[model samples]
Target: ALRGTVTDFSGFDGRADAEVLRKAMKGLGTDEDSILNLLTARSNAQRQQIAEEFKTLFGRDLVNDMKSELTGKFEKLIVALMKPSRLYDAYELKHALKGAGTDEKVLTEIIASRTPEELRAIKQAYEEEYGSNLEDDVVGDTSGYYQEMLVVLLQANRDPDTAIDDAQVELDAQALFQAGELKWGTDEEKFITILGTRSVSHLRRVFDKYMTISGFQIEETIDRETSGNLENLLLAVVKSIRSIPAYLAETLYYAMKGAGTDDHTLIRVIVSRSEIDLFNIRKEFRKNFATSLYSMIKGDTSGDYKKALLLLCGGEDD
Candidate 1:
């Protein structure tokens, strides 16, 4: 996520005085624009160093001072630069929407799009800061189909390199038995438990062998097994397993179809996934949806959200 090499001001013995940083930003006055430009354009690690330099000399926390002086997106970008931990990022995102009223867009972007590692960091940060689980806060904030999607995304943790084999085939078939037709009919607990817990890599192979062996995809099996929210969750897991591109393309289609696009989900998914398989997702998006991701963003979002998403999507040219 920190996309570039860090700036090493480590050996400089000159006073990293507050006056030095203050004088460096004299041209920008007290607006913090100069500092913001310097830090935000640097990787997060570099920015942390810069913050320390500011404090060492000036006897003040540059990041904290900036937080107090700046407002809105400007503040968000700069503060994000100063955060030494993803927990800080998690804290920022949580605070952005944790008031009496919720900011669905912020929530969606932070919770639904994080990579497994980043999500793990965020969860730790969230719990440490708030003394409550991020999942608990999420459940309290969201509801219905959107809520279910977010929950499944939060819970999904695919093994990085698992593959289909004799053992996995047996496991998948057994999972089907436990979740689908074991005793009576569908077993909700078994269904969500197994689907949510498996790694994406492992599940991918499982789905492949499951289909070849059973003559049906897991998605189809789920359709026959349950209905409502549980069905939606299972289908999501299945689609994500077999072809995430197809799954994402479908989500985007519906997200943009209503009176207004689900800009929150749109931004969150594109931003979060870019570091992972975004380029591939884009390729898949184009191949399956018959359009470009750029066009989708241009048509659906605007202002800073659009700009941020575009930057995180590796830029329009990419």
Candidate 2:
């Protein structure tokens, strides 16, 4: 479900938004409050329109002007707001795989959660932006079963049809049981094949049946059967299948857990989910963590960066 706190402003005028932004940037000191109020109040679609208007009116790219003026996480947030979601996701994927170490969690979260249509767009954006295929990068940056699972997901082959067959779900549950808890050596291939190909609705039924027949959660089975990146990937698949919002809530929680913040993960989840089930993600976050995501953001971040996050978040602790 695509959800967002920021809706298109009533009586919105792109020209007016553009002019305000231009003035904010033209002055001696940038008016941070005006920038935040204007940008944060509008939907992403409206923002894109405002960007076009800014270019036409000022003969300057709004994003470039903002980039020149803003610095730190605030700059990053504003930049994220400017790009189309698919392009932003492609950018994140590029950043994850670029440099020395790969951000496996970022790769997993994206590949696991994106719909087939969304994945196709992301793939197109990725190839156009980087001149390299997304799958090829995944293969190059990762190794072993983990790489294989990611490649399969990158295929974007999951059946999106929602017709659920209970018998088929039962069979898949048995297959998973036989492949994991029922057997001496786990058939990792079976787990990946079933998990990667089945529709989410079907997978949800399979999970419920698996728990009924095995008396143990499929997640527990995966945890017992696999290790390392493979385990993480499979768990992510299961989580996403069950409830993407909950999975994302967990992702945000883990990103902020421990000594310091995983700023990339924090920013990525919040930005990507902002227009897609972020409201539900917030609900799940509070449900799972007994803390408001708003409160957590306030505690973990500061300055304009924190303000931007809270604005997107919609509200503070209830």
Candidate 3:
């Protein structure tokens, strides 16, 4: 039903005249913020009508105009709201960071937050618009732990369908032996395919069998074999498989440790993944950590950033 409504709005019906969009914007006054918040948060199908109406009535691209009107993160948020094509959001980020500076926050938010399907779509859209690969550019521009993490995320290939048959356990054990024990280098492809593709239940069995054969926990082996963001990626994957609650507990552990927090990773991970398995994540957080995820966030971060995150997390506003 909403999809049909979007179709109707995007069509070249007589209602799409420039005057129509301008008139639509008129009564809203300068409360563009409210307008933006309401419209953008709606499903794309619903926003399509308002976007088309805004363009037709106002004789301007709604997003482009918003870009001109807004600035900073607020602008980015608003533009993300206005774009009907998710690709446009990708383009916006690409353009924002294609120059001298790197918006690591934006890059991480995009890569970490998006679903596998959404990531694939963004990659396709990015290439279509820029005539260059987003991954390649990221590789060229960023380096160190940040780069390593971003690259693994950009790969975005976790498939969640693997099993733990006898044959599969032996196969995984051999791969683990090669990577964990033997002098020869790791076969990262096998590691990624197996680790990224398996469900938590299957992976626990796989890990148990691999540990029985190799005599080392996969987590400990990864720590020995890799460093920087690559290690973090491996750790996150392994933990997520073995015990999701434990994984999140560790994330929270890191996020709030010492005098200062790694707020970037903390905020990015929660906000991006909230739409994914967040409800489960929260359940896991409490079961494993004996504390609410919302409480953890409340103890950290402040102001609008906290507000936005809390809103995204569906916690009551403070």
Candidate 4:
């Protein structure tokens, strides 16, 4: 089960929330504190209530009012928080795909990390919002094995069977070895078919024996054989399958690893995972990085952006 920091507010009144928000945004400079505090206190589900009721109470969209009031990164985070999770994901994907340059990391992380059912909904949301097919947009921006892998993932037909077949595991492992280290040139088809369609459980065992057969981990071989987008996409596929929370934890680590935060990543992940597995992501962050996400945000950012993030963080880990 997901452990979200944000939960439904006690005795929540959308009218009151709408009224307060309208009051906050009504005149002069915004009461950013009340806006952030009230909105952040409610779960995304409840925020939707306020969104609808906000519009119902008056003739304006809550998000539209929010955008008019807050500026820069803070607005971005609040808008993301207001959306339902999958819609936010689809919007992110759209932003990446339809932008000046392809944001492959965004595409890779979102596509690789989400489950088939989740992807189906994301695609649904994409069409409803963008009035275009996700496949067309995705395919137009990519080509080669990268494109193929994206198509396969966009298919969202990964085997979800809990049952494992031992024989197929060995077959796939050896095939991987032969297709790369054992052969003169890599046969990416094998990697794509086995990796992109097989159950993640099956792939785990495939990698386990692949280590024995190739005398190395699967990542090393993939690293050596592939380069650029294919390599990044393939690695993300491996990482997400291995463990989603750990994968997300590392993504969070990298976003704040160096000077000048990748604020987009910080906002995207915190908003998206807040109600999903942010606690688990935070758990793995401490385990892997010896630091807390709560403190990381405090050190990296200041002002309402930082305050809103800390509230969503719920509490300090250490």
RMSD of each: 6.2, 1.8, 6.7, 1.4
| Model 4 alpha-carbon miss at residue 289, Å | 0.9
| lDDT (C-alpha, whole model) for all candidates | 0.59, 0.88, 0.59, 0.89
lDDT of 1 by residue, 202-247 (tens): 7676677667767877778878877764466566666756665556
Candidate 3 stretches greater than 4 Å from native? 1-41, 64-75, 81-85, 88-119, 135-164, 182-204, 239-276, 288-290, 298-306
Give model 3's TM-score versus the native structure: 0.63
Which residue pairs in model 4 clash with each other? none
- Ranked by TM-score from best down, the candidates are 4, 2, 3, 1
- Looking at model 2, which ten-residue stretch has the lowest summed lDDT? 1-10
The candidate that achieves the highest lDDT relative to the unseen native structure: 4
Residue 19 of model 3 has an lDDT of 40
Q: Write one digit per residue (lDDT tens) for candidate 2, span 260-294.
A: 88887888888877887899888888989999999
Clash pairs for candidate 1 = 16-57, 17-57, 17-58, 18-57, 18-58, 158-199, 158-200, 159-199
TM-scores of all predicted structures: 0.60, 0.94, 0.63, 0.96
Clashing residue pair totals per candidate (backbone < 3 A): 8, 0, 7, 0
Residue 261 alpha-carbon offset, candidate 4, angstroms = 0.8
Candidate 3 lDDT tens digits, 99-141: 7987754565456445467778888888888889888988888
